[PDB]
């Protein structure tokens, strides 16, 4: 005769993968921007 709650904790899981889903998009993004710049010159 009593009753219980529950809680959450965010675990390295996100400490890494979610921060990586910023760093690893913008950085591959940096590679893609470089590609785009080179293609622009090539097309010219």
């Amino acid at each position: 005769g009593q009753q219980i709650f529950s809680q959450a904790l965010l675990n390295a899981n996100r400490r890494g993968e979610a921060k990586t889903a910023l760093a690893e998009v913008q950085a591959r993004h940096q590679e893609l921007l470089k590609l785009e710049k080179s293609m622009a010159e090539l097309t010219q």
Binding site: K34, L35, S38, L42
Partner: peptide, 19 residues
């Protein structure tokens, strides 16, 4: 590794076209 390869090929092609 694929895209770097692509970048490398594009850079080579730019060189040939400048030539």
């Amino acid at each position: 590794s694929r895209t770097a390869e692509l970048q490398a090929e594009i850079d080579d092609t730019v060189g040939i076209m400048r030539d």
